[PDB]
Symmetry: C4
Subunit: 316 residues, 4 copies
């Protein structure tokens, strides 16, 4: 099943045995990168799912064997930012990986024998931030390149083929659950009020259909909350006048962008507390533990070298 | 009542005085392992109930005097995993201790003059994980050997004798509260839908009796939540078709196992916060405190040795 | 108002500048122990109210000037235990300070120009644990000596004089709010069911009066919760039989003591989280900060001494 | 967009790279203080909004380029105290900056191209503590100088001009939301009951107007809660008599000040937990990480110097 070195390396990747991870990796043994436990653990997914930044850095140093897609979906599926910046600095990125032109075949950084598929066999990596409304990740993605599928309503060329394949329409309502959350339309492309006011007529035309109804009604609710929240955070008369309707308009829009984003980040920081955040704090404490103890052992090794030098001097 | 060394050793076992625990244990005094305070504290139960992993390792190094049963029931009664792996690596385990063939007599790793009996004088150690739905501990136990009592409904050979003894039927309803929680039937033996659908008829036949009624009704509720939750996490048509009803079936079942286990672990990590987790964090901080301070004292001792060597050189 | 050394010493007593507290105290300046800020802060009350154990130890080393009563009432008014054990090891204790024979005059370890009076000008120190139901502090106190006022109902010798003085009857209902909470009657003196069943008739005789009514009704509720909770945690028939009514009786009573105390400590550890616990965690982190940084500065001082010795050797 | 040193300095100002902040600042490069990211981040606002006290100290050491107004509004908008004391020790303060005599023009320590305006283009810095009811900050401010606008009801000299300018009346109701919260009237100027009883007639005269009604009704509710809370915390008859109506009166008022402030601080410390406090704890852990690791690297540098000295001795 599992050798001794595999269990050492996997518990090291779990619990922040960072110098032990070093002394396992820089030894040239048959290290067997991508060892999987009873579930999909993959020795890197554990490092992402437990806030181990430098372990992910050391694993991305070895670009021989990896599974980067589930790693990025873990790092976005929770509120991590540093791990996302570490994963995006990789030669399988930087205008090498897009989302629009893609068949049903799987490949590198598309999960197969996955630990978990997030939400579908055809599922973009810019869909996970918007369902979670994580803003800074969308800054990073749209600053790279806006990754939106630009969904289409029945062209019937190859869309009818995928309609005849399987339950694609769940992914259709899911793709419309992309385009109307707070974070992307608060960051997409200017005159946000125009796009916000062109959404709910389209989702009511979706409500002409009768399959996924209440979800689209909730999307209309979210659009209404957007409109009211944009009407709330206004002080002077000109703010209200251009919320009702050149350079000053774009300045006022950027001001309301800043206000809505910062009040959304305040509203995220006034909630209850999940246990995963305490899991992250415990892993921080354990990483401090192993780093400080084994670098103190390195200090004792340097003192032993100095003692050997002094003993060689005293023997002389 | 208590000597000075006993109070030192007990507060050391409480609060993570790990090098003080070392300098007490490796001295060959009359150390009096298994000293008990005002309640059952036992100098090891404090280490388990306060997240002190290395103290439990050092105490399991001395296999002279111990009380392992309450230690394992503490380590499973809370969400500890490392302490469970430390306790199970012990010569009172590894196919040396089973659960089925057992009389009413107590023995080693069966608590007597206990700090606490968990739920009964005849109570298996694989019952505590399932009431708490801790998954990884059940992976470890069933990977050792599935430990289920395989309960029986009135054979009247010796079961009638224990019926005439005492209130065994509370333990009967308790033993049926084992077999229907999420974690074990999500991990027992394949075609989980068959076992889940054979449960509620049997618990309705229990509802023919009128002693413990609402508990069995709640078990039927939990089975219904299982069935609906298994119907939720499906995407393609074949998933729904084999949830409705060879190799592909077993693959689809393992996929749904992975999905349900990971969404259950996400649902555990989105709750409120008990104070015992902050107790664990405070004990982590205190363990860091004592480790770093007294190993820094060891560093000063090494520098004092180097100073004595340099003074002996300068005197020469 | 405040000199520079006073502000240094007060912020040191707040935030865990433990070696700075050392280098202020062991210097023989006019240190002015008991400096008070804008409110009652007293340079020791800050150490108690912010979890600074070693600072309280160093302040109790200097027994020249102090204010111990408010310190003990802070340490009991929150859930501290180590600070209580540190304060009780003091020559103003250990059968030197009692609670029954006491006039209205204030003295040492009775607060005057206090930061705060807890609940009254005549208020025992064993009343604060029972309102908070902190168990281990009551173990320590009753193990020293049970400190109960043994309240009396209208003797009219000097009780009528204090009745004619002021609103003593608020303290009368408060003194009856001592004697019926979970922790003391779970730890007072055996046959707890007898005392629990003799309480509510007496509090109904208090309900014959009409001043503080709903409080006494709530005390009767708490007594009912006690009786039902004692009826819950029973397994064998003999437990129920002696809960209904020699050596085995005392054994069964001690078993139910252990069970009720441990389930009460579990029920305390499953609640929501107040911000004061995070204040304690932040003060732990700051204490680690200042200890590790300034003892690392001591290590650099020792290395500078070794460098001076090596330079004196190389000059030779 | 951003150079390499700018990204290094900004992530250092975020995450507590305190010796890296030192080695960036004390190098005499074109460091570009006040670099702004995608939103207003300003390299100091990140240090304030993430609990980095020594980074704010090092940034206030360089008084060349700064933005102090948003820094103080961040430090007061959350519950920080040490950062407020660090910011107020600055030559743009100490009776150099007032609040009453001020036109509509912006200047130093008045935000422009701000990250965020808190509540208005004319908004005093003593308004943020009272809406948050932070007590110690108001002690510091009123101990400097009470900063209240002393609002006026229609003088029509220049007040009518600002009435004709814009929506000033939102700031009028906001300025009345200053003067009636718990913290300031619990700390303003004696006979608090007189001011508390002169408030609600004035806010009912505001309720003669019909624009902001329910807010003023809530202010009357808060005044009623004040009056009832002051009536609660009384024990002797004289306390009730002077709450109903010389030296003893002022003593009793100061006693009730102490009692109400300390019970308000207890009521703040019994709430649920926001995630921003865990953000502060994570930043404490990361600051400990970088400090201890890079000062341990300094210790290794000192040992390397000692090794070079010993090698020069052994070569001799």
């Amino acid at each position: 099943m599992l050798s001794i070195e595999e269990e050492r390396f996997l518990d090291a990747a779990e619990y922040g045995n960072i110098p032990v991870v070093r002394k396992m990796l820089e030894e040239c043994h048959s290290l067997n990168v991508n060892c999987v436990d009873y579930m999909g653990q993959n020795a890197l997914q554990l490092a992402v799912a437990n806030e181990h930044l430098e372990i992910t850095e050391l694993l991305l140093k070895k670009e021989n064997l990896s599974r980067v897609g589930d790693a990025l979906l873990l790092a976005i599926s929770k509120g991590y930012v540093r791990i996302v910046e570490a994963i995006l600095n990789h030669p399988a990125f930087a205008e090498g990986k897009r989302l629009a032109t893609s068949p049903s075949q799987s490949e590198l950084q598309q999960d197969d024998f996955y630990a978990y598929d997030e939400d579908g066999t055809r599922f973009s990596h810019d869909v996970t931030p918007i369902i979670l409304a994580a803003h800074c990740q969308e800054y990073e993605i749209v600053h790279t390149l806006l990754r939106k599928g630009a969904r289409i309503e029945r062209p019937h060329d190859y869309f009818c083929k995928c309609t005849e394949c399987s339950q694609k329409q769940k992914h259709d309502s899911f793709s419309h659950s992309r385009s109307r959350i707070n974070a992307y339309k608060g960051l997409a492309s200017p005159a946000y009020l125009s796009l916000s006011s062109e959404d709910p007529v389209m989702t009511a035309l979706e409500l002409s259909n009768e399959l996924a109804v209440l979800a689209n009604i909730e999307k209309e609710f979210k659009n209404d909350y957007r409109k009211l929240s944009m009407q709330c955070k206004d002080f002077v008369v000109g703010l209200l006048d251009l919320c009702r309707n050149p350079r000053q308009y774009q300045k006022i829009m950027k001001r309301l962008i800043k206000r809505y984003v910062l009040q959304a980040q305040i509203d995220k920081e006034s909630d209850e507390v999940n246990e995963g955040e305490l899991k992250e704090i415990k892993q921080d404490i354990s990483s401090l533990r192993y780093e400080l103890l084994e670098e103190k052992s390195q200090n004792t090794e340097d003192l032993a070298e100095l003692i050997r030098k002094l003993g060689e001097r005293l023997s002389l």
